Symmetry: D2
Subunit: 307 residues, 4 copies
């Protein structure tokens, strides 16, 4: 008997929905879209509106909304986007319990699933999910590398006036100040960008990448990015579901890699049927090594804010 893949997308907000919707139209499998019971009606409203567009886009996928994790039973992938002028401490603590509470139900109804976390801060929350899940390091990944690279590509595209298919960004660690960009491993059709873009403009593109998610927040006035984040999540689900062995930047457990371990950190990754198949150790220059250390201690910080 052939069964289509089953993907459960927890949190039915702006990214979780846009994600659920891409997942459906591509026919990567049936999508179960979960939120708290107070938002179950909306979440079934957002499932069904999506599913009523299944005749029109000509895609065969089931899309249901629910407040009940029994609907998540036997998922291949689980993507967690669930999350809430307030302190860093109370954001990390608040989202952390939500990570613990989402996880216990997820792994319970989905024992052999791969989990992809988006939740902010995705460095410490994927940690929380890794921990809480019990799962071996390969089955728990965070998104942040692919969205940063994607921002930098777009900027590098609209600067050279070429295709986004031809620009490859290389981002290490998390977002903004925690970002360790590798421009030397960034190209336009394999041409090092550092020979196409002048430093001042390239330094600008780096900082805008850093300031990329804040920038959308200020544009919207109410909320953060969901389109590009959503597209980031799907592409990593596409990698696992189709064992594509993608080299993409992911948030990943480190067990000695770059001389660090017992943390999550955004690193070069091979993405396939066993989720994270290989963390990749680059040989890094002295500035990169030292800037990575800032970013590692900047993640050990939020992890001191975990309870």
């Amino acid at each position: 008997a052939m069964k289509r893949k089953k993907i459960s997308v927890i949190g039915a907000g702006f990214t979780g929905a846009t994600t659920a919707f891409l997942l459906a139209q591509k026919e990567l499998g049936d999508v179960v879209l979960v939120d708290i019971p107070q938002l179950e009606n909306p979440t079934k409203g957002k499932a069904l509106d999506m599913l009523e567009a299944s005749p029109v886009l000509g895609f065969d996928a089931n899309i249901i909304g629910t407040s009940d994790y029994a609907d998540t039973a036997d998922s291949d992938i689980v993507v967690i986007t669930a999350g809430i002028g307030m302190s860093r401490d109370d954001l990390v603590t608040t989202n952390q319990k939500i990570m613990k509470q989402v996880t216990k139900e997820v792994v319970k109804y989905s024992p052999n699933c791969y989990i992809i976390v988006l939740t902010n801060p995705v460095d410490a929350m994927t940690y929380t999910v890794f921990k809480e899940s019990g799962f071996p390091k390969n089955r728990v990944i965070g998104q942040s590398g692919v969205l940063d690279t994607a921002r930098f590509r777009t900027f590098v595209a609209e600067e050279l006036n070429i295709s986004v298919k031809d620009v490859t960004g290389f981002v290490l660690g998390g977002h903004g100040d925690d970002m360790v960009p590798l421009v030397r491993y960034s190209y336009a059709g394999g041409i090092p960008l550092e020979k196409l873009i002048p430093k001042d403009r390239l330094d600008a593109i780096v900082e805008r990448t850093r300031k990329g998610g804040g920038e959308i927040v200020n544009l919207l006035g109410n909320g953060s990015a969901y389109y590009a984040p959503a597209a980031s999540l799907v592409e990593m689900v596409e990698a696992i579901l189709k064992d594509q062995r993608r080299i993409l930047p992911a948030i990943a457990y480190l067990e000695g890699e770059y001389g660090y371990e017992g943390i999550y950190l955004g690193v070069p990754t091979i993405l396939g049927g066993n989720g994270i198949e290989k963390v990749i150790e680059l040989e890094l220059t002295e500035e990169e090594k030292a800037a990575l250390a800032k970013s590692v201690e900047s993640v050990k910080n939020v992890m001191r804010m975990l309870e």
Copy 2:
């Protein structure tokens, strides 16, 4: 030096934004997303967040957010989802009228910078609002269309897919007239891989599917609480956009301007149509049963009702 197509989506709300997103990702061309001046930053927020997903999904489109119609310069297709939704305290006539003025302000600007474009109208009441854009655009009837029956058949097909547990791709569906009580389904022209549905589903459930397809927009309003359908409505718009942009000569129900078709004239109404590169190519004039001919009459008195509400 023959370049990308240009689609401008007026209103950067849930429908305009979702629709713009689908358009770009199918590389149907460059998308200019347009809303009011207060909401320029949020629009640009939506178009920037879209474009930034393009290196991920591997589609090459320009997408911009803007309240300056300069940016819609020489658009091939224009989708109007620019609209008020019901304001608690509003009469039918106030919405109807509030929305018409928006059509006039939006249309004027659309033919100013894109006088040789094709216009697809979602704004409620769509029957009355596509008419507004036709008589203010000064366009030929073929260059201005309303979306309505795609979303109603897409709804109908899902419930029928769900009843018979078969691919939505092999379920079809026919409706003339509008949404709600205006909707004029032909079960006799609805099927499952070419088996008329009446042979497959009992009468209680089949009537039940029709009823669910009148109330279909309401179903989605009641579940969300605030807001309305966007994904199904956006896909629908995208089907009609795709038809015209690729000259597909599809047979879709669209809101088109009758000039004697079914012996009605000077109006827009949901009729079967060829949709292709000349917009609405033909209105298909079916031979209906007296029943159908007369339920369509009720449906057309409805469209007249609203039409008497235009200032």
Copy 3:
């Protein structure tokens, strides 16, 4: 471990190659192109060529070429196209026996290495060649499938599409019976956007179209001069493969072991089918006219008259 679906395409000729290329392209799995040892070199040269396309079209599928059934191990779907064509000074009986022979020798080696595969058969005469495969496979009826209906309705839809000047998306067809002459197309079950084709095409034009579809294959071999159609055939195979692999529960006309449906038993025939993750989920029994029951018995007559040449 999440693993990709594995498909094996027996016979690396025009149809089997093409099928292997389309499958690869859709990322529907890993593809194993399988001919006789004498054509192993050219079969590996196709698989590599196909695989060398994948950086360009942008799919990750693994394609290799073998004579050896060992690289078909634990295959989910096997698509049997392997066969010989008509050789001059050879009768009906000797192509049938020779192909049957091949059907039997391919299948003992397919069901050894892939015991829980679904098998889609193309080899002409398909209805008997499907029947052989089902006897030698010892698999239940739902796992052994033939292609013929989708090819022919595609041919029919293409002729109506030409005839009306509309997209083929909105043309629906339905054909029971084998191929060529022994082919039963229901014009009453054929529509252009849900509208019966009898209301749109006059009877001379609609009968001739029905006649072009009967001769549909021969038309192409007469134009080619040397060999039979491969694009339309391989596409047909892919939709059927895709329906099993994404459990899409399509209503498709497939070749299916009849066990009382349409008043027939103990044969494989073109019939209505729901094609899903469990192969042939169910044959759908239509209400036919006596003209159609006699028209289908004519097909079964030529079909059974072919089955007789077996052993």
Copy 4:
């Protein structure tokens, strides 16, 4: 009135036919299949077989087979695959081909595949009367794609994440830069030692012959048709890709008066510009050994 993009595939054999299907499949537009009027019927039934697959795959595309060039009227793109499974034999086809092609589609971009392609595209360029951006060759997209394959098998990572770059002719004329190839963006020199990297460069070079040598009585059509289509799509969708492509140099790299595989921007106006990679002392010397052969083939012409 909105109207389809039209693509005439000149050559209705293995590469010509395989290209037109894909093109129709992707809905890049309407497709005229062409060959000699002898082979008018085999063409037409390639055209019909393909158009008969459209209901099943579900793409709206007119695919027609013809030997009358009138039916290739108004083509946006013209794909030249008319050759013989001899630079003088394939030269003399280009000349008769190009004259009718500029005559029905005078506005059209010409992407050529016929071997020896840099010399056959050059021959197309000279008869065409068109600008240097309007006549393109296909080489590096195929060789590079053979490279990314071999580099994909070797590391077992996605093909999508392998990058490649080959400058120069088709065969032992190829000068791919292993230092402008990567896997995940991380240079291959760092991922693969010199004896196995040398082997991938070697296998890339023989690439075409490996395909001939297995097949027995033809050459490559699946990777070649995809390579053409990618280049069609760049022009038809103004994609503005940086693809390896055969391009008429007028100074570039201190070479001119010759077609040769070089980095380019490929998009709406065809080849918009060729890109000048500054090269290691042995890449320049090696590019020259490739050209100096290439030039000879053009002293095989007329």
